């Protein structure tokens, strides 16, 4: 405790998690009450259940602000959806997590990237429905989908929102590369950190 926590994959509508402002993708739950959630066990579930219908303090690390904040949630059986928080999580490390995005740079007209609607300089590719094996990356995926549709999650810094994008890489589209956009990776190519 350490760099591990429960990554917030998703939150349901009208859930205690949504009510409390837990943010899918960007948030990691790292503590509940005084308990540091640095091991993958039942502590989080067990404490939400032992405190059902009562306010509970979480600490939460957010990638877009790069700060830990405290969040009060009221776990509940009463809100009509699944779970006491209504959140989907996965035990994970936030240490290097924000490094694994790829920044869309210039986009050529008529290119695969343009046909997909990738937006120059404001789009960041953050995921896929494909699972990366270790030592694979975004370029692995582009390279193995020649002529095949690839479904990507993309975060946009200008609208501050995520959306699903499908791109069909095409080495024979006529211009350079199989995407026809530049891609940046590294220090100046991560999701902009927001003062909030």
């Amino acid at each position: 405790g350490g760099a591990e926590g429960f990554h917030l994959h998703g939150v349901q509508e009208n859930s205690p998690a949504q009510q409390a402002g837990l943010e899918p993708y960007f948030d990691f739950i790292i503590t509940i009450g005084h308990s540091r959630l640095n091991k993958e066990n039942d502590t989080l579930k067990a404490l939400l259940k032992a405190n059902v219908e009562k306010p509970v303090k979480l600490e939460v690390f957010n990638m877009k602000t790069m700060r830990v904040r405290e969040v009060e949630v009221v776990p509940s059986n009463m809100w009509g959806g699944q779970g006491l928080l209504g959140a989907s999580v996965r035990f994970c490390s936030f240490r290097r997590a924000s490094e694994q995005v790829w920044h869309v740079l210039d986009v050529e007209p008529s290119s695969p990237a343009a046909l997909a609607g990738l937006r120059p300089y404001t789009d960041y590719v953050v995921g896929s429905d494909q699972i990366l094996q270790e030592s694979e990356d975004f370029f692995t995926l582009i390279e193995s989908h020649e002529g095949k549709p690839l479904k990507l999650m993309v975060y946009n810094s200008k609208s501050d929102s995520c959306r699903e994008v499908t791109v069909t890489p095409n080495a024979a589209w006529g211009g350079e590369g199989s995407l026809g956009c530049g891609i940046g990776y590294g220090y100046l190519h991560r999701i902009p950190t927001q003062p909030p």
């Binding site: 990554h7 996965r90 953050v126 995921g127 896929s128 990356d137």
Partner: peptide, 22 residues
């Protein structure tokens, strides 16, 4: 339907990515 997986997710000991509802 098939879930969006952040690029920093890695498969488990069973080549699965289980996401938990809490």
């Amino acid at each position: 339907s098939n879930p969006c997986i952040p690029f920093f997710y890695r498969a488990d000991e069973n080549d699965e990515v289980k996401i938990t509802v809490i």
